[PDB]
Symmetry: D2
Subunit: 185 residues, 4 copies
Amino acid sequence: KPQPLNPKIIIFEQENFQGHSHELNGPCPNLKETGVEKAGSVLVQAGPWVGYEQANCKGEQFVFEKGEYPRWDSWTSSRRTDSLSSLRPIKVDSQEHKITLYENPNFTGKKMEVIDDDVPSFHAHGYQEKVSSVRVQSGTWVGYQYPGYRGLQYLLEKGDYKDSGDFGAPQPQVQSVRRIRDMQW
Amino acid sequence: KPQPLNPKIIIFEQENFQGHSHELNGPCPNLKETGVEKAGSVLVQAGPWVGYEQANCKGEQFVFEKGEYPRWDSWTSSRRTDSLSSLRPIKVDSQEHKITLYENPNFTGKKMEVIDDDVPSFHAHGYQEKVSSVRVQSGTWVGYQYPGYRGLQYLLEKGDYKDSGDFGAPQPQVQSVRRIRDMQW
Amino acid sequence: LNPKIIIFEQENFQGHSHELNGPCPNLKETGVEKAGSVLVQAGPWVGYEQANCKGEQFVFEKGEYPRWDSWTSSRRTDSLSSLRPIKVDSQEHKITLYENPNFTGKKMEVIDDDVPSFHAHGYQEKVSSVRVQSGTWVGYQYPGYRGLQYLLEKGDYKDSGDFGAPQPQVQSVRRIRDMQW
Amino acid sequence: LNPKIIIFEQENFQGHSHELNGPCPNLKETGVEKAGSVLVQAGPWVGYEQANCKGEQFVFEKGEYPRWDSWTSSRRTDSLSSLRPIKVDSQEHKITLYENPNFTGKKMEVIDDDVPSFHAHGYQEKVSSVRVQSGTWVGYQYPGYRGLQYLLEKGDYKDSGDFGAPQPQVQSVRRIRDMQW
């Protein structure tokens, strides 16, 4: 289906998602000046978002996340109800480290997208093709030449690498990947 | 393609996988009584396998894994050559913990297969359907009712569970999963 | 220590204190209906709505639950009827590097992860024994997995030789994860 | 400590010892052509075949490399021509729970993982401060994530109140992983 370019969330009316609801797509510090008045139920189609008990954002919050929230009890283990007054999307910080290898130079064709997780045989994660291009989004990676990080070593830090010509290889042969994980200087 | 029911590995002859090779599918404590004589190169189509320098299995081993091993230097960072004499498959011990949720009772239909990794919104790992069956292969899991492991709790230990009727739920509603990870008794 | 849970009388840990170290089907009548707290000193356990460990459930991990409002992210249950220690299927991959031989002095316990270099872990000593508890590992000579490989698998390695190490040098250890067949 | 590498004269750490704490383009001529060892006391660094840091590479992590046979899982290189400290992009998600207020005494550092219960981690004390370094976390009241939620995000929380805690109770912390939009 279509992939949202922003947070979504349809706080309802009759609970159980029955009837009469409004979709809010970004901060909304109140809820009367909303099609709705009292937080009926909640449907989250892309989050996460963080609530509040007191409009203008203060009070006992709650963290809603993709899924269905069928009724008041539903987003408060607290049994402390009096619904939804503030609704802000959580703009979550998340730290991944990605190197993405490419089939043919110029970063096109079949790729092998790896993250944090280190990989020894590219041949076993299903990639089989030669490796000619690479775009290092983050982390410090050290791509070997055979499986079990053995043979020829190549350092691969932040920056796209278009050819072995600029990523120091003879045969565009990287069987394995390793992430450097620690410094001490 | 077809999924092997056993280890594979075609130690070759002319290096670079050129010419004249033999496929070994299980322990083979020697290599003359092989189409081959001297470990030319190695192609592994399903491993891992562990070698040796001295037939009958003793000496300086090496661990080959899916991928191509183009020439002697290739599976020895040691530069200590004199090829392959013993070839045994590694029958690796690996410990995963799996709970696998099901769409319709009787463990059929759309499933959500989770491992070690805990999951909060099933709705966000792409599963959307109700949850009526479950087969707990391992680990100690505690499946909630909404996202963020909230609402109703269900314990789910080793054993298949055919209905809420036997897995204690009212509405076949498990939005989240959690693995118990530690004991202290 | 076997399971240790303390059922109290009322909120905020006041009054009636009792311990428990095993299952309990009708604790409700064993002398406990005033369940207005819960302390776990070792578990995890499980509570119930009804008794005989049947009914909507709850799980206790360890530490305080001042009011029923922790175990019932609601209130649609009954009053704590039964209890029961939980049995945890938790697998781990433990290798343990013994500096001296036959398990002595310096020691490195590795649990699931890959170690490109022992030095940075504080391990600067030789290696002579290796008693593998789970999983398939393979020990390198120098760090970064370069050098001599040493499959190390479920079992005991008596000496560096006892696992093909000419010299007792092993600076790296990494888990073998997959199985292709 | 800045990068610290010691280039030696010959095998097994014998002879000529030199330290290094920065890059070095032609160390080969700086007085070092007899590269028959390498000790890393802090890195990681990188070697080269040729000089100017150009040529087939190698990486040193920390601890001993008695003979060229570690850095060259071959021998198709030149003799150690340049060196250079490495810059590591390593992200972590650190939350740190300060027992007293304004950062004092007991403290819990959490790095990436989910903590269903602090008690089992040894943390049995209240909470009053929380200085979040990375990632989006959310603090529970009781353990198992039941109770009061507290988004805790990049920044400093001065007191339990300073992050909506009526009472300074927080037994669980779990990372928020996804972003849907």
